[PDB]
RNA sequence: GUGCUCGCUUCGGCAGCACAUAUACUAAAAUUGGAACGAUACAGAGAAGAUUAGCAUGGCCCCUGCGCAAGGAUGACA
């Protein structure tokens, strides 16, 4: 992600690269955000 | 069918008369065909650059060598 910070990327490529911090934050707090206490509703299993 | 004709005619009947005027995708049944993104089976990183190593070229500035052209200043008695 650091090496790609300056490599002449298109706007759509950079927009899809400023999401890694959000993905890492969501994964760090995943045992709390994905809880079924928060987000009441049906649960879905990843098929692997 | 109902009721009526001063009709034939008998109450057993007959001839005529008024009203009735055109429903239905019509259908109960006939058959043989073509068929999932529903399951199981497979795969499943389901969103990234699709790369980095040398050398040479190209630009600028010196230094050295060779060539071409045009030149400058200087040196040498018997």
UniProtKB/Swiss-Prot annotation:
Localization per record: Nucleus; Nucleus speckle
User: In what tissue types does this protein appear?
Assistant: Widely expressed.
From the UniProt entry, list the residue stretches annotated as the region Important for branch point selection: 4-17
Membrane spanning stretches: none
Q: Could you name the domain of life of the organism this protein comes from?
A: Eukaryota
Role: Plays a role in pre-mRNA splicing as core component of precatalytic, catalytic and postcatalytic spliceosomal complexes, both of the predominant U2-type spliceosome and the minor U12-type spliceosome. Functions as a scaffold that mediates the ordered assembly of spliceosomal proteins and snRNAs. Required for the assembly of the U4/U6-U5 tri-snRNP complex, a building block of the spliceosome. Functions as a scaffold that positions spliceosomal U2, U5 and U6 snRNAs at splice sites on pre-mRNA substrates, so that splicing can occur. Interacts with both the 5' and the 3' splice site.
Instruction: Copy the domain comment.
Output: The MPN (JAB/Mov34) domain mediates interaction with TSSC4 and SNRNP200. Has structural similarity with deubiquitinating enzymes, but lacks the residues that would bind the catalytic metal ion. Contains a region with structural similarity to reverse transcriptase, presenting the classical thumb, fingers and palm architecture, but lacks enzyme activity, since the essential metal-binding residues are not conserved.
Quaternary structure, per UniProt, is: Part of the U5 snRNP complex. Component of the U4/U6-U5 tri-snRNP complex composed of the U4, U6 and U5 snRNAs and at least PRPF3, PRPF4, PRPF6, PRPF8, PRPF31, SNRNP200, TXNL4A, SNRNP40, DDX23, CD2BP2, PPIH, SNU13, EFTUD2, SART1 and USP39. Component of the U5.U4atac/U6atac snRNP complexes in U12-dependent spliceosomes. Within the minor spliceosome, which acts on U12-type introns, interacts with PPIL2 and RBM48. Core component of U2-type precatalytic, catalytic and postcatalytic spliceosomal complexes. Found in a mRNA splicing-dependent exon junction complex (EJC) with SRRM1.
The disease tied to this protein in UniProt is: Retinitis pigmentosa 13: A retinal dystrophy belonging to the group of pigmentary retinopathies. Retinitis pigmentosa is characterized by retinal pigment deposits visible on fundus examination and primary loss of rod photoreceptor cells followed by secondary loss of cone photoreceptors. Patients typically have night vision blindness and loss of midperipheral visual field. As their condition progresses, they lose their far peripheral visual field and eventually central vision as well.
Protein name per its UniProtKB record:
Pre-mRNA-processing-splicing factor 8
Recorded source organism is Homo sapiens (Human)
Q: Which residues of the full protein are shown?
A: 1510 to 1557 of 2335
């Amino acid at each position: 992600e650091e090496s790609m910070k300056w490599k002449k990327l298109t706007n759509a490529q950079r927009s899809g690269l400023n999401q890694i911090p959000n993905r890492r934050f969501t994964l760090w707090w995943s045992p709390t955000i994905n809880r079924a206490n928060v987000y009441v509703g049906f649960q879905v299993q990843l098929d692997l």
